[PDB]
Amino acid sequence: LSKYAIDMTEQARQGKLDPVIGREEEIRSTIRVLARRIKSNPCLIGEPGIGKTAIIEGVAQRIIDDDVPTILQGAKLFS
Amino acid sequence: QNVVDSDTISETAARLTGIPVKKLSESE
Ligand SMILES: Nc1ncnc2c1ncn2[C@@H]1O[C@H](COP(=O)(O)OP(=O)(O)OP(=O)(O)O)[C@@H](O)[C@H]1O
C-alpha cells in the first residue's frame, strides 16, 4: 500500500499534524460509522474549507491517541 | 451496551441524516 498511499497514521505518529476543535463530533460519528458491520464507510460532505481534511487528520489523532475502540484503534490510515 | 430501538435509532439517524427533531430533549 505504501506504493499507492501515504500512511497518515504514521505521519501523525511522527506529528506532522494540525489538531482540531469542535469537529470531534463528526469524528465520533466517523468512528461510529467505521465501527459498523455493513456500511463501514463514513464520508465527509460539505463546503470547501469546513475542515474535512482536518477531520480526517482528527481521525488519525484518535488512532494515535488510543481514543478509538480496538477494532479501529489499531487501524492504519492512508491517503 | 445494547441497541435500544427508537432511542438509539432516532439519535443515530439524526446524527447522520439530520433531523434532531426525533431525538427528544434531555429537558424540553
Ligand atoms: N477544526 C478545524 N476546522 C477547520 N480547519 C482546520 C481545523 N483544524 C485544522 N484546520 C486547518 O484548516 C484547514 C481545513 O482545510 P480542509 O482541507 O479540511 O478544508 P476541506 O474541508 O478539506 O476543503 P478542502 O478540500 O478546500 O481542503 C486545513 O488546512 C487544516 O490545517
Side-chain angles (χ1 to χ4, degrees), chain B residues 11-26:
Chain B
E11 178 73 24
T12 297
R15 288 172 179 172
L16 298 175
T17 65
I19 300 298
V21 174
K22 300 306 291 186
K23 290 180 179 183
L24 298 175
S25 179
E26 60 273 5

Side-chain angles (χ1 to χ4, degrees), chain A residues 18-21 23 47-55 57:
Chain A
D18 293 310
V20 300
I21 63 91
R23 299 281 71 76
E47 290 284 307
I50 295 297
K52 301 190 298 304
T53 302
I55 289 168
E57 289 191 356

